[PDB]
Amino acid sequence: ATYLIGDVHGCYDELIALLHKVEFTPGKDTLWLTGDLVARGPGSLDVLRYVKSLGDSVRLVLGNHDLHLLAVFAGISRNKPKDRLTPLLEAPDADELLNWLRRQPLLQIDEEKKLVMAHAGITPQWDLQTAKECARDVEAVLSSDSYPFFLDAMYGDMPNNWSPELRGLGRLRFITNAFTRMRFCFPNGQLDMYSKESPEEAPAPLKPWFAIPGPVAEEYSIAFGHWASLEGKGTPEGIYALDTGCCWGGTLTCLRWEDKQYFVQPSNR
């Protein structure tokens, strides 16, 4: 079976209990994770160790908190106490865990299920081939010896409009925001980087990225995490919002792909 779980945010206890509920069996089963494995929750260190041990029984995409973790580790960015990253940053195997973490994809595609995963979704301004090229480009810089320069360059909110003629730092920033930060879109598809409210509370003319028809969503299902204020609600057919705010006192949600059945683990916080 194929299982998809949203933002774990260090909620190791709830992750293991959810996986025991469905009797997840490495080897017979595969786990897809929407990223943001770390921060906010108490057990970011245990979650990384466990997800890394899954090997090819796990298909991960990196979220914005994963990237922030890598920026702190490399001394690019300052640690926020609220993130509870210190046990992970101070662990003896932190190098091993974070070098593995930076080599993970931004995008996962399964042609047989016609299923696509990214942390925040697929911008409607991208077709599949553009999405893949963009993920390859940012993954290539993240798995390189020079990744702290990228992590520094990535921070920013412009440009917010895709073009195949975007070059250099601006192309990198947009790619990073589209995969890990996107929520709302203007009618033309351009990213809005500031609103994190629910769709009904958002100011016009903002609509959610998935309410704007795009080439990927028309041929593929898309699963994503990231957008907690959506609460997993209000998406169209074929769009699966899996982040139900576990770290925030919501729930950890698992979707089994074969039968589209949901399993829910309440937050222990």
Ligand SMILES: [Mn+2]
């Ligand atoms: Mn996120």
Ligand SMILES: [Mn+2]
């Ligand atoms: Mn998140």
